[PDB]
Write an enzyme that holds these catalytic residues in place. Structure first.
Site, PDB file in Angstrom:
ATOM      1  N   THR B  45     -14.057  -3.085  -2.791  1.00  0.00           N
ATOM      2  CA  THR B  45     -13.149  -2.866  -1.674  1.00  0.00           C
ATOM      3  C   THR B  45     -12.510  -1.487  -1.773  1.00  0.00           C
ATOM      4  OG1 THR B  45     -12.634  -5.192  -2.097  1.00  0.00           O
ATOM      5  CG2 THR B  45     -11.541  -4.121  -0.238  1.00  0.00           C
ATOM      6  N   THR B  46     -12.083  -1.109  -2.980  1.00  0.00           N
ATOM      7  CA  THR B  46     -11.442   0.183  -3.186  1.00  0.00           C
ATOM      8  C   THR B  46     -12.399   1.334  -2.908  1.00  0.00           C
ATOM      9  OG1 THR B  46     -10.217  -0.959  -4.931  1.00  0.00           O
ATOM     10  CG2 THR B  46      -9.939   1.434  -4.770  1.00  0.00           C
ATOM     11  N   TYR B 109     -15.420 -13.033   6.374  1.00  0.00           N
ATOM     12  CA  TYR B 109     -15.574 -13.198   7.819  1.00  0.00           C
ATOM     13  C   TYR B 109     -16.248 -14.510   8.219  1.00  0.00           C
ATOM     14  CZ  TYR B 109     -16.677 -12.092  12.704  1.00  0.00           C
ATOM     15  OH  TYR B 109     -16.776 -12.122  14.076  1.00  0.00           O
ATOM     16  N   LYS B 164     -13.077 -12.225 -11.047  1.00  0.00           N
ATOM     17  CA  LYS B 164     -12.064 -11.240 -10.775  1.00  0.00           C
ATOM     18  C   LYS B 164     -11.194 -11.910  -9.741  1.00  0.00           C
ATOM     19  CE  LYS B 164     -11.063  -7.001  -8.122  1.00  0.00           C
ATOM     20  NZ  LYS B 164     -11.725  -6.011  -7.333  1.00  0.00           N
TER      21      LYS B 164
END
Ligand SMILES: N[C@@H](CCCC[NH3+])C(=O)O
Ligand SMILES: N[C@@H](CCCC[NH3+])C(=O)O
Ligand SMILES: [Mg+2]
Ligand SMILES: [Mg+2]
Ligand SMILES: [Mg+2]
Ligand SMILES: [Mg+2]
Ligand SMILES: [Mg+2]
Ligand SMILES: [Mg+2]
Ligand SMILES: [Mg+2]
Ligand SMILES: [Mg+2]
Ligand SMILES: [Mg+2]
Ligand SMILES: [Mg+2]
Ligand SMILES: [Mg+2]
Lengths: 296, 296
Positions: B45-46, B109, B164
Site C-alpha cells: 500500500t505504501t 473491494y 501482517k
C-alpha cells in the site's frame, strides 16, 4: 445535463468454463430489456469487475451496447478503477464504443482524500463527453465521497450528473438533494429503493433486478410518478429477497439465485469469490419461493 | 516453517516526471540496508500498488531483490491482488525473480467470504515455494481475514507462515498467538509496534521506517531481545510521528516527510493520490523537527 435514470440493473457476469459466457450475457441483458428496465450497467461490483481482465471488461461493455441498440434501454457502462489513469482509459473506451454513459466507483483500497477524489473524477469527466454517475460504496472501497465533494463535482463538471449511493445513509440522501436538488440521486441499495426514490431520487441501480426485473421496474416507475403507495408496496414486498441477496457478499447470492432460477447454466465465480455456504444456498432457495421469477 | 521476520520497511515508490525514479528507489533501499533494516517490502500500500502498472510493480520487485543482493537484507515482495489469478501471477514472478518471500494483501473491494479468502491464499501458496505472509488491513480492503482463517491457512499451507496485521485490534493479536503460537505475527501499525512485539510478534512492516529506519530497527531488535523497556521507550518517542504519518491516507504523509527531509526529489503521487492539505504539510514538517532523520 444529459442524465441516465429510471430502473437500472447491475448486470451479473456469467462464467462458463472460467470464461465469460458471452451468449448468456447477451441473453440476460435482453431479458432485462423485455421486463421494463431502463438501463443496464455492465461490469460493476455485481459484474465482478475485480476479476475480469481489462479485455473482458471491454467485451462486456460491447455486448451491452450491441444488445441495447434499437431499444430505449441505455448502457451505463461500469468504468471505475482505483487508478485514475485506468479509470480514464475505461471511460474513453466506453465513450468510443457507444455507451450512453459511465458509472465510476470511488477508488478502493488506496483511500484517496476528498481532494484526490475531486481530481480523480474531474479527470474522468474531462476525458469524455457522455454522462458520468459517481458511485459511493464505502463498505467496499474504504473511502467515502462526501456530500460536499459530490456537490462540488456536480456543479464543476458538465457530465457529472449524480451519484449512485450504497451507503445506508438516508441522512446523506437528504443532505444531497436538499443542498443540490438538480442532481440525480440513484439508489444502490435495493432494500431502501423506495425511501431514496420518495425523497427525490430518480432511479435505482439494482442487484435484485437481475432476478426480478419486472418488480424493480414497476417499483421505480410507480415512484417516479409519485405513486408512492404502489412503489412502497413493492419495496416492502421485496424486502425479504432484497436482504437475502446479501446473506453473503454480492454477487454471491444473486448468482446463486440466478442459477437456482435456471437463468444461468453454472454457479461459477472467479476467485476470490466462491459458492455460497450450503446453508445460505438453502436460505436463498427458500426466500425465492415467495416470488414469481420471469424466465426468458 | 521458512520465515521472514524482523524490522521491515514498506517502501515508498518515488516518482519523477510521472515515472518510477529507479535510481532514487535503489538509493532509498540502500539507506534502509545501512540502518539495520532486516527486509524491504516493495510495492505495498505504501508503495502505491494500486497505481503502478504490472510492468512497474515487477520492476520495483527486481530493483529490491537486485539491490539487496550480497547483503543480509531480504526482499518480501508485495504481491497482493483482489483477483486470485493476478495474485498468483505476482507471486510466481516474485519467486522467479529472486524474492525471499511475498506479502499478499487480503482482496479489496470485492469482499470475499472466509471460504473465498482460504481458497485465494491456498492458490497463492501452492503456486510458489517461498514464504507467504498474509496481510490484513480491513480499513482499506473492506474485508477481514478471521483469526480462524489465518490459523487454518497457517496450518494447511506450507508457505504461509504468519500475518501482517493493520487492524488496531490487540485482542485479535492475543487471539492469534494464544491459539497458534508458532505463527509470525507482524505489526502493520507503527503506533502499536511495541505492544504487538511484546505479545510475541516477531517483526514490523513499517511506514515510519521509510523516514527513521534506525529507530524502527532498534525498536524491533530491542523487543526481540526482550529489552521491553528500551523498545517501549522508542515506541513512545515515535508516537507523534507515527500518528502524523496518517493525518492523511498513507502514503501521502510519508512521501511528504521524505520530500521535506530531502530524501526524494519530488513530492509526486499518482492520482487519485495527491499532495496533502497545507495544514497537514505544515503539521508533518513540524512533527519531523523532533526526530533525527538519517541522510544517505
Ligand atoms: N483487479 C483489479 C483490476 C481490474 C481490471 C478490470 N476491471 C481491480 O479490481 O482494480
Ligand atoms: N489498480 C488495480 C491494478 C494494479 C495492478 C498493479 N499492482 C488494483 O489495485 O488491483
Ligand atoms: Mg479476452
Ligand atoms: Mg464502476
Ligand atoms: Mg482497475
Ligand atoms: Mg490521469
Ligand atoms: Mg406514468
Ligand atoms: Mg437448477
Ligand atoms: Mg538483521
Ligand atoms: Mg500485498
Ligand atoms: Mg522465531
Ligand atoms: Mg491545502
Ligand atoms: Mg487540513
Amino acid at each position: 445535463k444529459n442524465i441516465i435514470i429510471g430502473a437500472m440493473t447491475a448486470l451479473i457476469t456469467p462464467f462458463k468454463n472460467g470464461k465469460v459466457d458471452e451468449q448468456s450475457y447477451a441473453r440476460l441483458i435482453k431479458r432485462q430489456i423485455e421486463n421494463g428496465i431502463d438501463a443496464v450497467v455492465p461490469v460493476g461490483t455485481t459484474g465482478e469487475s475485480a476479476t475480469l481482465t481489462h479485455e473482458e471488461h471491454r467485451t462486456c461493455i460491447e455486448i451491452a451496447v450491441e444488445t441495447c441498440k434499437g431499444t430505449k434501454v441505455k448502457v451505463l457502462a461500469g468504468a471505475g478503477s482505483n487508478a485514475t489513469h485506468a479509470a480514464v482509459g475505461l471511460a474513453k473506451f466506453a465513450k468510443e464504443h457507444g455507451a450512453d454513459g459511465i458509472l465510476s466507483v470511488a477508488p478502493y483500497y488506496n483511500k484517496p482524500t476528498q481532494q484526490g477524489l475531486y481530481e480523480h473524477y474531474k479527470a474522468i469527466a474531462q476525458s469524455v463527453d457522455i454522462p458520468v454517475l459517481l458511485y459511493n460504496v464505502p463498505g467496499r472501497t474504504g473511502c467515502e465521497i462526501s456530500t460536499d465533494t459530490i456537490i462540488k463535482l456536480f456543479r464543476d463538471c458538465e457530465n457529472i450528473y449524480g451519484v449512485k449511493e450504497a451507503s445506508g445513509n438516508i441522512d446523506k440522501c437528504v443532505d444531497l438533494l436538499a443542498h443540490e436538488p438538480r442532481m440525480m440521486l440513484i439508489s444502490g441499495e435495493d432494500a431502501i429503493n423506495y425511501p431514496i426514490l420518495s425523497n427525490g431520487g430518480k432511479g435505482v441501480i439494482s442487484v435484485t433486478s437481475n432476478l426480478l426485473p419486472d418488480m424493480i421496474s414497476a417499483l421505480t416507475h410507480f415512484a417516479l410518478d409519485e405513486n408512492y403507495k404502489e412503489a412502497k408496496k413493492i419495496n416492502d414486498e421485496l424486502y425479504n429477497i432484497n436482504k437475502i441477496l446479501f446473506c453473503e457478499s454480492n454477487p454471491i447470492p444473486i448468482k446463486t439465485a440466478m442459477y437456482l432460477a435456471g437463468l444461468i447454466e453454472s454457479l461459477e465465480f472467479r476467485l476470490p469469490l466462491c459458492s455460497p455456504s450450503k446453508e445460505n444456498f438453502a436460505k436463498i432457495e427458500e426466500v425465492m419461493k415467495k416470488y414469481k421469477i420471469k424466465g426468458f
